[PDB]
Design a protein around this ligand. Sequence first.
Ligand SMILES: [Mg+2]
Ligand SMILES: [Mg+2]
Ligand SMILES: [Mg+2]
Ligand SMILES: [Mg+2]
Ligand SMILES: [Mg+2]
Ligand SMILES: [Mg+2]
Ligand SMILES: [Mg+2]
Ligand SMILES: [Mg+2]
Ligand SMILES: [Mg+2]
Ligand SMILES: [Mg+2]
Ligand SMILES: [Mg+2]
Ligand SMILES: [Mg+2]
Ligand SMILES: [Mg+2]
Ligand SMILES: [Mg+2]
Ligand SMILES: [Mg+2]
Ligand SMILES: [Mg+2]
Ligand SMILES: [Mg+2]
Ligand SMILES: [Mg+2]
Ligand SMILES: [Mg+2]
Ligand SMILES: [Mg+2]
Ligand SMILES: [Mg+2]
Lengths: 195, 139, 175, 191
Amino acid sequence: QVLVLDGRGHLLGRLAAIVAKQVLLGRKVVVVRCEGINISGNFYRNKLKYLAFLRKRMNTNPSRGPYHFRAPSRIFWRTVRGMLPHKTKRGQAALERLKVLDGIPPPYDKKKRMVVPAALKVVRLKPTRKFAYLGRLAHEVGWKYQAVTATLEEKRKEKAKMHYRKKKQILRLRKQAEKNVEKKICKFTEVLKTN
Amino acid sequence: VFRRYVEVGRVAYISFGPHAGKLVAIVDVIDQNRALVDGPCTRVRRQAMPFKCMQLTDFILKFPHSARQKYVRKAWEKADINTKWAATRWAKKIDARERKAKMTDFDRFKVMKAKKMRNRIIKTEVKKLQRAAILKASP
Amino acid sequence: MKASGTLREYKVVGRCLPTPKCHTPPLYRMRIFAPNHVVAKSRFWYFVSQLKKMKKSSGEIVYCGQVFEKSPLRVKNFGIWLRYDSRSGTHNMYREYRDLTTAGAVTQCYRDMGARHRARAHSIQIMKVEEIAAGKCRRPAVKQFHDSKIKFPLPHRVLRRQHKPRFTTKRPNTF
Amino acid sequence: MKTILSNQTVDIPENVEITLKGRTVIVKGPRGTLRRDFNHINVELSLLGKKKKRLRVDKWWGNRKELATVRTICSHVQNMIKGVTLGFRYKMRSVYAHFPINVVIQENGSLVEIRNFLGEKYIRRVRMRTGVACSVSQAQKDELILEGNDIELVSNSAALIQQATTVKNKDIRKFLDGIYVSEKGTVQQAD
RNA sequence: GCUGCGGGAUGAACCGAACGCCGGGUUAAGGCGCCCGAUGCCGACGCUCAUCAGACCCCAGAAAAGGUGUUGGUUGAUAUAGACAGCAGGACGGUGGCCAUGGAAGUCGGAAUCCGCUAAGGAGUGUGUAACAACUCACCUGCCGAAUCAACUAGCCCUGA
RNA sequence: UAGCGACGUCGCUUUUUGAUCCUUCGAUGUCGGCUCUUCCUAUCAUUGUGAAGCAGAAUUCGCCAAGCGUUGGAUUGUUC
RNA sequence: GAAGCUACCAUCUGUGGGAUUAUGACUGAACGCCUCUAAGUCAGAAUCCCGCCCAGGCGGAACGAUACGGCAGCGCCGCGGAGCCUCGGUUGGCCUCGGAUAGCCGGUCCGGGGUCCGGUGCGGAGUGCCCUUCGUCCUGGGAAACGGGGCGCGGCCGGAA
Ligand SMILES: [Mg+2]
Ligand SMILES: [Mg+2]
Ligand SMILES: [Mg+2]
Ligand SMILES: [Mg+2]
Ligand SMILES: [Mg+2]
Ligand SMILES: [Mg+2]
Ligand SMILES: [Mg+2]
Ligand SMILES: [Mg+2]
Ligand SMILES: [Mg+2]
Ligand SMILES: [Mg+2]
Ligand SMILES: [Mg+2]
Ligand SMILES: [Mg+2]
Ligand SMILES: [Mg+2]
Ligand SMILES: [Mg+2]
Ligand SMILES: [Mg+2]
Ligand SMILES: [Mg+2]
Ligand SMILES: [Mg+2]
Ligand SMILES: [Mg+2]
Ligand SMILES: [Mg+2]
Ligand SMILES: [Mg+2]
Ligand SMILES: [Mg+2]
């Protein structure tokens, strides 16, 4: 009943629009690994845009004003909130369906991740265009947990490597068993109706 | 890298469009976005089709550039593309997709009933092969 | 003029009304590119009024016929003469295109003019369209195709189906 | 105008072996090995021929700005071959009109210590990039030989040394003082 | 004003359209990434990269001028009797010529401006000397080897801001 | 053409004045000074720079640049 | 004149890292040469962010104690029974990284190299397993030696974001 969408390789707005449209329908969406979301344009251009956004702030009381977030997950959350009607009760109720998270936590490392090809940088941008990584962009402005994020990502990748090796061994054994039991299993129906 | 090329005499497959699902022969390239295609033995007339509309294959035929139909059909029959087209793993997958789409309710029921007999024996043999490998790696 | 969709070739003949001072007018003919016969006749009247002392009231159109391409299956090269009008001043131009049909070449010319020079169809006068051989092709973008045994791959092909499997576990290979 | 094909061929000598896992180019020769990632060029590289092994660089449907990199790739491969065969040696001479510049090497030429530059008491320490070794040549006065394999590293270290000695708050035309790269060549001759 | 309604986010005059209460279909102007109904078309051609992009009459921003950043066009001039770039060689004599003068010996000036051997050298395109010397250029030639040079013109972008 | 640059010509500003009277006449308390906060840059100095008719020093013209300072008094109600 | 408040009217302290602007540079084509740029690299500052410091959210964690007195009261495990408020779903998918001018699978040999299949992806999410089952009983063929469910026991914590 949930949609676990990977974050790496997807464009910021191209993915956020799809998530904002899918949340208003009722599907609970969880965007994992938000530090890999790419943004079109020059990295210095995106940095200048983010700094111009940071400059905007209430004069009389900055604490009671625009709350600028530094984590890339919170950046993506604010981007989706900018498209959702958050000032109405429908948008307020839909905002809990979206779960933006940095890294791949225990509740989501075992779940298979989905990829939306309509937001992938490979098909969205030309191979000669410049892009900026949201993780580096956030780390350059008031983000401190990039090192531990990368360390935990390395750990979970080294674990998933062994898991995939085990799965590949199981697949090899399955293919060997299929090739071994040739008799007693005709299954001409499977071939005539093509699996 | 780049083992396929468009050229005078390349047979391609139409993925989408009015002639979707048929093979054509690229006679010549026009304006780096569309090419003239003949497809004499595949029941299609000579016309211009975009490059993004067609999908390249492995077979190549010997045509002179801007050749006539009587000269392209002869080379098509000499290369004998139609009969060897069924003897490939690609047309077989396409026909498999067509059959899975043409499945009826009785066919789906028979497939579902055959899966019960097919997968269980495979699982009980995998359970033996895994323990055999464990016993082999035990010492 | 709109030049919507694809253009069409029309041979339009016309002559002034028989007046007591002189009969049997020279019956001038023109070759107009237009989407339909109505705008074809309108453009013919505009051109013949700009050329000679002829108007729609004092004149008449004798015949207006669609002209089909003599070889729609052959790849040909067309040299287009333009008398276009820019923001500052009007200028003449010679372009070259490669297409199967004369109407197709004229459509390509209209689209390329509107794209590269921001020139609307209101201020574009097609002067002359003639098929030229490969030896008299001065444009390099067209001359680069006059080579037999031409070979080139199609690298980095777009997915084109981004939204049919909108949610998937796949990453397009693009090769 | 979307040129169809742009190809460039590079010859390879018998001493050096070149390999490619993709856009990555690895050249193994008599003096060390080089490896460079060309993942930001988007151009085809293919080696062909036995006992000759010529490397062709192919670009399909490139604009005027994209057709320029096909020559830069071949120039980089040529520089890699030159550095792995003969190496790159930059002789930098120091102009010391009044105050003699005292240059010394610290650890196997990986660190350069410059003393008494225009009389300043400040000690300028410039570290060399990995793989570049510097020394004080003999039979010549106030010069430094910087030898290495990668040209983009040797010349980078040379530029660092040159910019370390820069006049400030004074005239640039006057006060001609500092280490300038006089000569650029190879370590091995007859090639 | 005497006037609601659909678009221009917002609105007195803009664009459609005028008004009893309802159900079905269609449409004008406008729009189809999400706010927000509809392109989730296997849409077409081409232009554009900004460290201040750009995004729809009124309407809410900008000029003269410039760009070896790209993309088209026009008028022209050169090149197998081997150019344009690059490397290398020559770049002389009458003559340190005529008006000047503290010095002008091609190089601060006015007018002029030719001649002979050459393969080519201009009473000399610039740097430099108070002047002479020196570097360099027009010009010719040696190697390479096939296209190249110059001026305008207008679309996006950039400086001007 | 380091620095200026006439004869001409193209722009920004509302820190001067002026033109109109659109809101305010059942009242928006109309000069200056004192105290205090913030912002702007068309930068006086300070940080890092380029160019001079920049030998050094002292200077002049610009570039990214508003983070930090830009005072004490005589007479004047004075802004100046 | 004690104590306390107070004075630049006495006293103590006020600190560094990153990406970079302007600018100077490396390699280097476009454009045989040149060029800081066209793709890629380097140094770079009272500016930008953070570090130090100030307050901690309708932010969450770790730990202690968890109701005597005489009938009580409250927790944990295993539980059978009734009734009330809420609003939402009609099988679950237990996972390599990474590119898109490249990669997947299988493997003899010396984490990488070579070779062999697959490649508009079929060891494929247009995918695959459990599956579309109304239940009970008698009796035959194939498969099945794990048995098949666990209010059951012991060994490992297998895995800390
Ligand atoms: Mg903070
Ligand atoms: Mg000075
Ligand atoms: Mg009235
Ligand atoms: Mg009225
Ligand atoms: Mg009205
Ligand atoms: Mg309205
Ligand atoms: Mg009207
Ligand atoms: Mg109207
Ligand atoms: Mg109605
Ligand atoms: Mg409309
Ligand atoms: Mg919608
Ligand atoms: Mg502008
Ligand atoms: Mg508006
Ligand atoms: Mg206004
Ligand atoms: Mg221009
Ligand atoms: Mg007034
Ligand atoms: Mg009052
Ligand atoms: Mg008041
Ligand atoms: Mg301040
Ligand atoms: Mg104090
Ligand atoms: Mg720079």
